[PDB]
């Protein structure tokens, strides 16, 4: 397909970011929201900070307080046999391999800017930083819809009481209404549609589920945006396919004659993350018209396949202009990329594919 | 508490009742929802059937077929060695014990009417019978909420792609409006609060956390009961005590002077169940005022130790009479069970251990 992987790739690294806790090293600036704002890109990056620890057999989970509102870490021995250390990303129960005890990282969001879409500044402090006991591991992954002037700023927020998906309102990136939990744990890769369609508000969701079901997108109406409901499953996984150990929303739906457009991450059982494409109806986006075979996006680039967590493309946003998009993504879990394709050329994939 | 268990209990038995499926044996009829309509008591009885193998060496699995809208049994071997059966409720594989592949049963909903509220008689057919993809393994546990005139009948919801909860509306037990999957899996035990509270809905509700998380109840809120969000975390666990392993909501919560009184299930690790209660702030439900140290309701009588499975006791519905309060329950995933009690011991109890 026509891939225009920006010069600048990787555009945002983990060099370009300095740490605000002290004796902590920022292991990833990533998968970052995608806003249009005063005539600016705003990238609403995925900042993770690991703290370090001069034994080489200990390593710290970074825990927010929001009682008391600080840090405390959590030391663990890399021996400790009640423990898995084996993925970078979480400090696990031998018996619950399936979740995690910790992650390894603490996430917040802070905003960087671009007037050419390539070369980006970094705002000075934080946008979103841990402010309640929902966000006790973090605040990751912010995907932006923007309807009229409001802008829908919604993230995964990670506390022992799990994985559910928030959402903060603006109208300038500055004053922030917090409006709760959205959707309840387990839940991640959210993304609001743009519009209202035929009299109700939609959103992707991703439930993850313990006793039965699969790492399935689903769809939600709501009258307001607050609150959601009628929930359907939309998309499945697909045994031996790209998609075959999970799907989840990455860029927010896009209006097309053909129907909303869906830019999608997919992954295998062995965690090799790729870009699909849906298509849904367009007055009823419950219904599914088409689907992609083969992926949009790759891990082939070198700082798409080595970092943090190696083999990873994850798209949380993209900007229209015209048929062009311009898609930026996670690399490795540690970086951001650029990339522009076109609509009609990913239409055409789905149509060739279906 | 002065408990006093009715005199017929069990009140309602598989004894009772002929199984709809050909072949099948009824193997519960419990976790009935309760509501007054028409002068009578209504018992949403759950009615579980297990599919009877003629090779004892097989365990068939009920699905229902969504698509040609009748059964479609799956079939299992004891030995296959993928499979853990050591649970009865359900076929498990051996590498996913804290889930399940298939139930062993089948339920759906059937409704029970009692003029004295101790001896029942039942509707003649089912009351909600899986109708969609999402409730391809069964209807379970259906709760009911009447604001007003309209009954919302809620309800597991369980499938392939999951367990959520779906509601069901309805002004006479006969006309129903199916209002969608109200919370989306992995949620259960959902009870909607009986009016609306400073402008809105509230409804408890129990995600089950595949990642992180215990089985907590949460809260949430809602401007139509059809959507929901808000989404809190309201009732933990608690290690060494009766809910060390589980809670969720049993009863629709109580308006009382004090708060809205939540008569909650808990459980243990080894799946021992009783009733405690909590007390919420009446303005804002989110805010736990009091919490009980002891239960309120265990599993003491025969017919609540023995059965299907045992050492439960699983109160799904109540009807208030002044003071007394007129409890439903499920015992041993078996049969159902009348007691009555008072409301001022539930609260004094409150009181007392909250200290
Ligand atoms: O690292 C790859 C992407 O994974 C997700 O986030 C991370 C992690 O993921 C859990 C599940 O959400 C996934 O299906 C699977 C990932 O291969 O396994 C993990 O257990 O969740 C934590 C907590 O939210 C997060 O810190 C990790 O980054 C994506 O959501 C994305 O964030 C990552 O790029
Ligand atoms: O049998 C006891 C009660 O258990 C739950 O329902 C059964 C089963 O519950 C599952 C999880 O929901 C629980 O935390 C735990 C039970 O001890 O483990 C189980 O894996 O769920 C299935 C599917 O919904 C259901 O058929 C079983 O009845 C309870 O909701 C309740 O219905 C039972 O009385």
């Known amino acids: 397909m026509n891939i225009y992987r920006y010069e600048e790739n990787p555009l945002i690294t983990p060099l370009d970011v300095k740490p605000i806790h002290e004796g902590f090293e920022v292991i990833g ?3 970052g ?50 423990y898995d250390f084996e993925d970078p990303r979480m400090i696990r129960s031998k018996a619950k391999l399936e979740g995690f005890s910790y992650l390894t990282s603490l996430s917040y969001i802070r905003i960087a800017r671009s007037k050419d879409g390539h070369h980006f500044t970094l705002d000075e402090k934080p946008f979103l930083y841990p402010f309640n006991e929902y966000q006790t591991f973090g605040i990751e992954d912010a995907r932006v819809t923007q309807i009229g002037d409001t802008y829908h700023v919604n993230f995964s927020a990670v506390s022992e009481f ?12 500055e004053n922030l209404e917090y409006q709760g939990n959205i959707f309840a744990p387990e839940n991640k890769d959210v ?29 939600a109406s709501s009258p307001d945006l607050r609150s959601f409901g009628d929930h359907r499953h939309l998309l499945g996984i697909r045994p031996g396919e790209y998609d075959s150990g999970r799907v989840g929303g990455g860029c927010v739906p896009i209006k097309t004659e053909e129907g909303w457009l869906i830019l999608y991450h997919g992954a295998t059982e062995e965690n090799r993350y790729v870009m699909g494409a849906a298509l849904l109806d367009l007055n009823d986006p419950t219904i599914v018209l088409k689907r992609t075979k083969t992926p949009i996006l790759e891990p082939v680039a070198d700082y ?5 967590f190696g083999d990873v493309v994850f798209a949380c946003g993209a900007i229209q202009e015209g048929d062009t998009l311009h898609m930026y993504y996670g690399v490795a879990d540690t970086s951001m990329a ?7 050329e990913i239409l055409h994939q789905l149509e060739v594919e279906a």
Not at 42 to 52: D, F, G, H, N, Q
Not at 164 to 170: E, N, P, R
Not at 304 to 308: A, D, L, T
């Open 162 to 173: 799990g994985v559910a998906d928030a959402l903060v309102t603006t109208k300038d990136f």
């Open 33 to 82: 929201g995608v806003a249009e704002y005063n005539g600016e890109v705003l990238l609403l990056l995925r900042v993770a900070e690991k703290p370090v620890s001069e034994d080489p057999e200990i390593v710290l989970a970074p825990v927010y307080n929001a009682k008391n509102k600080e840090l405390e870490l959590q030391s663990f021995r890399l021996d400790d046999e009640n």
């Open 338 to 344: 650029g990339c522009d394709m076109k609509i009609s």
């Open 304 to 308: 798409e396949k080595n970092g943090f």
């Open 29 to 31: 600036a990533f998968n």
């Open 191 to 219: 993304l609001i549609f743009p519009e209202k369609i035929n009299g109700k508000y939609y959103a992707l969701h991703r439930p993850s589920l313990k006793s039965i079901g699969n790492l399935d997108i689903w769809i």
